[PDB]
Amino acid sequence: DVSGTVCLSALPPEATDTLNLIASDGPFPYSQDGVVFQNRESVLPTQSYGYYHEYTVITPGARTRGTRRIITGEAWQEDYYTGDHYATFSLIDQTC
């Protein structure tokens, strides 16, 4: 279950960077950017394998890849933010 809908402005500014790179299909900072997200925990609505892809939201000052991601779905503006390695997701409202 998707935990509501968070304003893009309430997310780290790096989330906007990730959205830009999704739109340009890169170049991406991490090797796992663009891989299929399996949604094994049924947090997001069930869809075909390959419906969802995952991308890093860089954590500033982090040595590693951290816990922040955007998962894309296929539908118009269908993008989800997680700040905890997929444990929970919010829909990203790019209008606020």
Query: What is the C-alpha separation between 81 and 76, in angstroms, rounded?
Result: 15
Of 14, 41, 54, 78, the catalytic one is 54
SS (H, E, C) 24-45: HCCCCCCCCCCCECCCCCCCCC
Query: What is the C-alpha separation between 43 and 61, in angstroms, rounded?
Result: 29
SS3 20: helix
Cβ neighbours around 11 below 10 Å, total: 20
Method: X-ray
What sign has the CA pseudo-torsion 26, 31, 37, 41? Answer: negative
Resolution, expressed in angstroms to one decimal: 1.1
The answer for 91, left when phi > 0, alpha when psi is -120 to 50, beta otherwise, is: beta
Q: Which domains does the chain have, with CATH numbers?
A: 1-96 (3.10.450.30)
Q: Which two tokens stand for residue 93?
A: 């409202």
Cβ neighbours around 81 below 10 Å, total: 24
> Is 54 considered catalytic here?
yes
> Is 85 considered catalytic here?
yes
